[PDB]
Design a protein around this nucleic acid. Structure first.
Lengths: 209, 56, 142
RNA sequence: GCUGAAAGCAUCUAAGCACGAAACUUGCCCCGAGAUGAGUUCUCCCUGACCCUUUAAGGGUCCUGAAGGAACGUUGAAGAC
RNA sequence: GAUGUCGGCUCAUCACAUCCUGGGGCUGAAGUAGGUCCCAAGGGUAUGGCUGUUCGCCAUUUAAAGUGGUACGCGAGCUGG
RNA sequence: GUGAAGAGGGAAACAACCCAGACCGCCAGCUAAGGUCCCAAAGUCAUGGUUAAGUGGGAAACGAUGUGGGAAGGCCCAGAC
RNA sequence: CCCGGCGAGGGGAGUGAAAAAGAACCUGAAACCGUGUACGUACAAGCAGUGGGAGCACGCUUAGGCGUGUGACUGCGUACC
């Protein structure tokens, strides 16, 4: 079904009565307001667009303000879309809270991973380093060979080399739901999730099931 | 390590298409002295936002 | 005197609609390529596009003789080391029926900027309906 | 394998029908409309007056300068630039 | 009027005459475990002692430690036994 | 015999093979090899057959009720297979 | 006389037949490097030309439909010694 967009608060632990420590990621899921509903007749597919949080009034552009005004909801910090599974109905201006995950027991969390910048092959692709001694000449962490002789005469597409690492969309699947706190708008999931503290997260029920 | 053919003057010009400088969009005018200056910078006479900062 | 040459800014192009149901793929394609190039016009000029706009309907109902329905294979390389991919005639019809006629006509047209321009005048639809009524296409029994 | 002739029988095959693997197409994750075939949806902004002429997707003066953008500044768990 | 030679290191890529895993026929196939042939290239496919060695022998593992092409792949990437 | 010392057309590209020996100009005509559905100039030409394998467009010993044609023979309304 | 650092280097004035003869000085070629104008160029693949050829600009013309520059698109075409 549909999911919710939240914020990464941080990591902590939950102690159970049987002496087990559960590493949990605290996700703050504020109420999500649906700003637009799409159907086959008009858009060719079924989905809902939602917003969350608040944004400075003076920093909301006129085109953005008009979009929010049409739905009759306060401006959020972004817009996200969720596909409808042939059995869901929503109305413009509806508010969705964290109670949707009351009986899910497993969710998929996706976010933007931390940015490592330009990274070498050793870090990026787990390349093995060459000898640190025994005559090695300025080739301790270099990639090494990158192809074959005249026959191909080129480097193949997709070759693993150094480049930008991190700072990209990443999804972690099948994370246990430890607790749902409607009053505090909190969702605790076992394990770690992509992104740094304060980043945006999208939570959906597990697809693998 | 080194070229096998001499690059053309056309290729040289293409590489330099990104070398053009950019001029300052506009200069701020002090409210009191009225002289032009770089934005967020003190004037040549020592003024800044019409406050007459040290000019020794 | 000099031989007449067609002018790209004064050439007349007409609109036609063709039904591909039950038509042999190859024999239909040659006629489409011939008309897209303008070979049927006395004003034909090799360096000028003098063809006509053609609309093809029911592209998913073309016919192939023999066992080509399950034996004809379409190959294409993605550019990566694995690269090589293939799909049979049956698979192409199920997924992208328009590509079957489009691919056949493309190979029958000249290669180059002008040949690419000719291909732009071909409209292929899988169904029996088109939204080009404003152009008033004329039925072409080909 | 089923039914079944050519070939009174037989036969998985010629018409027709059903099973069958980490391979194939999907399903899972990421990129993706420069997909020049450049797509779709929502919202926002601009509602002056003249002149010349080889008289048309023409040129110029005055008035006007929106939505938004850029620039600059303080900066970031973003970053070689 | 120069195309640097075996071994190792790093990084690989393709073929299928398939080493493991998957699906089958026959068996002098009771079961367990094997033999042989057919289909199958998705992924996976040892560490050490000796020697410059590839290889090989040996020790001990593994579901398996496959066979070949790529200037007997790879020194404007390293090493130089 | 050709290339060497030989251009032009054909064989996809292809000194030595096939056609054929360029004094110069022409926006004229007929032919050679080879060709005439589209790329690409000219028969979707006419009549009678063969192939179902994309054979045509790569190959052997050998194997097989694939299919067309031809000349004979054995057994058969005393009832054959 | 003027700008400039009582600079360098220039702009006037003056001399001279000539200062585009100003001492980096007769004539002042080519490679090479610039400014201005016309045309082409951001979905197109290779000895960069050649044959065909639209459009645009411009000079003509008793509209004489030609000349000059540019060259969308298209056939052919792998430098020289």
């Amino acid at each position: 079904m549909i999911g919710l967009v939240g914020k990464k608060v941080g990591m902590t632990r939950i102690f159970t009565e049987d002496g087990v420590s559960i590493p949990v990621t605290v996700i703050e899921v504020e109420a999500n307001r649906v700003t637009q509903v799409k159907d086959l007749a008009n858009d060719g597919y079924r989905a809902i667009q939602v917003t969350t949080g608040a944004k400075k009034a003076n920093r909301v552009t006129k085109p953005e303000a008009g979009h929010f005004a049409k739905a009759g909801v306060e401006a959020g910090r972004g817009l996200w879309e969720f596909r409808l599974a042939e059995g869901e109905e929503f109305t413009v201006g509806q508010s969705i809270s964290v109670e949707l995950f009351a009986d899910v027991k497993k969710v998929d969390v996706t976010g933007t991973s931390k940015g490592k910048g330009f990274a070498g092959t050793v870090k990026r692709w787990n390349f093995r380093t060459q000898d640190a001694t025994h005559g090695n000449s300025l080739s301790h962490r270099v990639p090494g060979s990158i192809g074959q002789n005249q026959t191909p005469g080129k480097v193949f597409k997709g070759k693993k080399m150094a480049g930008q690492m991190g700072n990209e969309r990443v999804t972690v699947q099948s994370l246990d739901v430890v607790r749902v706190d409607a009053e505090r708008n909190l969702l605790l999931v076992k394990g770690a999730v992509p992104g740094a503290t304060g980043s945006d997260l999208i939570v959906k029920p597990a697809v693998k099931a | 390590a080194v070229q096998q053919n001499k690059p053309t003057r056309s290729k040289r010009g293409m590489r330099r298409s990104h070398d053009a400088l950019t001029a300052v969009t506009s200069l701020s005018v002090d409210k009191t002295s009225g002289e032009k200056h770089l934005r967020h910078h003190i004037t040549a006479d020592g003024y800044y936002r019409g406050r007459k900062v040290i000019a020794k | 005197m000099k031989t007449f040459t067609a002018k790209p800014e004064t050439v007349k192009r007409d609109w036609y609609v063709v039904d591909a149901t039950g038509k042999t793929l190859g024999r239909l394609a040659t006629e489409l390529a011939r008309r897209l190039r303008g070979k049927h016009k006395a004003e034909y000029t090799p360096h000028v596009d003098t063809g006509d706009y053609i609309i093809v309907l029911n592209a998913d109902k073309v016919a192939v003789t023999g066992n080509k329905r399950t034996d004809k294979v379409y190959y294409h390389h993605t550019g990566h080391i694995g690269g090589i991919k293939q799909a049979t005639f049956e698979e192409m019809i199920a997924r992208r029926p328009e590509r079957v006629i489009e691919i056949a006509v493309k190979g029958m047209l000249p290669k180059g900027p002008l040949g690419r321009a000719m291909f732009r005048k071909l409209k292929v639809y899988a169904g029996n309906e088109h939204n080009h009524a404003a152009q008033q296409p004329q039925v072409l029994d080909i």
